[PDB]
Design an enzyme around this catalytic site. Structure first.
Site, PDB file in Angstrom:
ATOM      1  N   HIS A  68      93.400-105.297  -4.511  1.00  0.00           N
ATOM      2  CA  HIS A  68      93.632-106.205  -3.357  1.00  0.00           C
ATOM      3  C   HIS A  68      93.700-105.385  -2.074  1.00  0.00           C
ATOM      4  O   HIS A  68      94.740-105.409  -1.396  1.00  0.00           O
ATOM      5  CB  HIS A  68      94.881-107.050  -3.572  1.00  0.00           C
ATOM      6  N   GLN A 269      88.991-111.928 -20.654  1.00  0.00           N
ATOM      7  CA  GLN A 269      87.901-112.112 -19.656  1.00  0.00           C
ATOM      8  C   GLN A 269      87.025-113.300 -20.078  1.00  0.00           C
ATOM      9  O   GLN A 269      86.629-114.089 -19.192  1.00  0.00           O
ATOM     10  CB  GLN A 269      87.071-110.841 -19.477  1.00  0.00           C
TER      11      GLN A 269
HETATM   12  C1  LIG Z   1      93.725-112.751  -8.644  1.00  0.00           C
HETATM   13  C2  LIG Z   1      92.695-112.120  -9.533  1.00  0.00           C
HETATM   14  C3  LIG Z   1      91.645-113.181  -9.810  1.00  0.00           C
HETATM   15  C4  LIG Z   1      90.457-112.482 -10.355  1.00  0.00           C
HETATM   16  N1  LIG Z   1      89.432-112.042  -9.612  1.00  0.00           N
HETATM   17  C5  LIG Z   1      88.496-111.430 -10.456  1.00  0.00           C
HETATM   18  C6  LIG Z   1      87.199-110.897  -9.958  1.00  0.00           C
HETATM   19  C7  LIG Z   1      89.011-111.430 -11.787  1.00  0.00           C
HETATM   20  C8  LIG Z   1      88.666-110.893 -13.089  1.00  0.00           C
HETATM   21  C9  LIG Z   1      87.503-110.049 -13.166  1.00  0.00           C
HETATM   22  N2  LIG Z   1      86.581-109.334 -13.265  1.00  0.00           N
HETATM   23  N3  LIG Z   1      89.351-111.119 -14.210  1.00  0.00           N
HETATM   24  C10 LIG Z   1      90.470-111.893 -14.120  1.00  0.00           C
HETATM   25  C11 LIG Z   1      91.214-112.179 -15.295  1.00  0.00           C
HETATM   26  C12 LIG Z   1      92.346-112.970 -15.163  1.00  0.00           C
HETATM   27  C13 LIG Z   1      92.743-113.455 -13.860  1.00  0.00           C
HETATM   28  O1  LIG Z   1      93.917-114.231 -13.778  1.00  0.00           O
HETATM   29  C14 LIG Z   1      94.304-114.855 -12.545  1.00  0.00           C
HETATM   30  N4  LIG Z   1      92.063-113.173 -12.739  1.00  0.00           N
HETATM   31  C15 LIG Z   1      90.934-112.434 -12.873  1.00  0.00           C
HETATM   32  N5  LIG Z   1      90.226-112.177 -11.707  1.00  0.00           N
HETATM   33 MG   LIG Z   2      94.889-113.605  -2.767  1.00  0.00          MG
HETATM   34 ZN   LIG Z   3      91.346-112.072  -2.771  1.00  0.00          ZN
END
Ligand SMILES: CCCc1nc(C)c2c(C#N)nc3ccc(OC)nc3n12
Ligand SMILES: [Mg+2]
Ligand SMILES: [Zn+2]
Length: 313
Positions: A68, A269
């Site tokens: 982030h 995933q």
């Molecule tokens: C705030 C994270 C949200 C998010 N952005 C991405 C690009 C992913 C990602 C991948 N590759 N895997 C994730 C698996 C679980 C998850 O739970 C909220 N968010 C994921 N996620």
């Molecule tokens: Mg956010």
């Molecule tokens: Zn974001």
């Protein structure tokens, strides 16, 4: 205002594509963002001095967290660029201005912890903002930087237009709260399939821009496999750190966040693509057909995680 940014031929060409990676050279990202605003909005949208000094304050207020971070901010702004350039008649002057800024600002001062962790920790931000905790903080920080001396990139707007663009940015950033994504897409799915979706209805545009924001924010899952694979490492480093902090409050974290349960990630995933990412880009493509590559790329990566589970990679 005769000063345009130009990228090298490969970036000039790849930047137009949804699956563009902004690369590992931090010092080029500000120029990449300016290039995108000048093409997507116009060279006259923002005074260059003010925009440059807005971009570096935003950069300063993103933290050195695994995922982030500043690179996420520019990556999400690029996807929005790619959506706006492929649907260029569907959006007002104010929306093209507001949405690239909304994407750059959307995770401002993120610490790499979920709204849930803030709540269980009893963080001061959780007392101030009972829902969408971090996302209300992010908007708060966006307004703070806009009110720094010399940083008001929207100075040339009227009183009405200014209030409209800050309202676009607010809804945009609040929609990045994935808890609100599920209900927002459902409503959109219904509206689309019963034929009641109407882009002259302001409350309908809000919902569509909401889904666009989810689609840009999740856009790491629409990259070429080697980019998506390596980004997942950064995403999971944050999840494991939060799991550690959960265990330190004396709470067993959900498996996703448990570093002792790394073996369960490929299945986790799979869950995420099916329940979140595929539905998001599906409904987006239905509403905005030219965004189909995001769905295609997302499916390709779903397929690559299925391969991981079978031990084919
Ligand atoms: C705030 C994270 C949200 C998010 N952005 C991405 C690009 C992913 C990602 C991948 N590759 N895997 C994730 C698996 C679980 C998850 O739970 C909220 N968010 C994921 N996620
Ligand atoms: Mg956010
Ligand atoms: Zn974001």
């Amino acid at each position: 205002g005769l000063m345009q940014f130009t990228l090298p031929v490969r970036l000039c060409k790849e930047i137009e594509l949804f699956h563009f990676d902004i690369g590992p050279f931090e010092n080029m990202w500000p120029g990449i963002f300016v290039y995108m605003v000048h093409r997507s909005c116009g060279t006259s949208c923002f005074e260059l001095e003010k925009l440059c000094r807005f971009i570096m304050s935003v950069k300063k207020n993103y933290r050195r967290v695994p995922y982030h971070n500043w690179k996420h901010a520019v990556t999400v702004a690029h996807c929005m660029y790619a959506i706006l350039q492929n649907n260029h008649t569907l959006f007002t002057d104010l929306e093209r201005k507001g949405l690239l800024i909304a994407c750059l600002c959307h995770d401002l001062d993120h610490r790499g912890f979920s709204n849930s962790y803030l709540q269980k920790f009893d963080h001061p931000l959780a007392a101030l903002y009972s829902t969408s905790t971090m996302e209300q903080h992010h908007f708060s920080q966006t307004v703070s930087i806009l009110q720094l001396e010399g940083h008001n990139i929207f100075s040339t707007l009227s009183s009405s237009e200014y209030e409209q663009v800050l309202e676009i940015i607010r809804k945009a950033i609040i929609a990045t709260d994935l808890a609100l994504y599920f209900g927002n897409r459902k409503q959109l799915e219904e509206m689309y399939q019963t034929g009641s979706l109407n882009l002259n209805n302001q409350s309908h545009r809000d919902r569509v821009i909401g889904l666009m924001m989810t689609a840009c924010d999740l856009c790491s899952v629409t990259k070429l496999w080697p980019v998506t694979k390596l980004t997942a490492n950064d995403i999971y480093a944050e999840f494991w750190a939060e799991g550690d902090e959960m265990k330190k409050l004396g709470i067993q974290p959900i498996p996703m966040m448990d570093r002792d349960k790394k073996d369960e990630v490929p299945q986790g995933q799979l869950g995420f693509y099916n329940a979140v990412a595929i539905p998001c880009y599906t409904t987006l493509t239905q509403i905005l057909p030219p965004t189909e590559p995001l769905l295609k790329a997302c499916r390709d990566n779903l397929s690559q995680w299925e391969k991981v589970i079978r031990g084919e990679e």
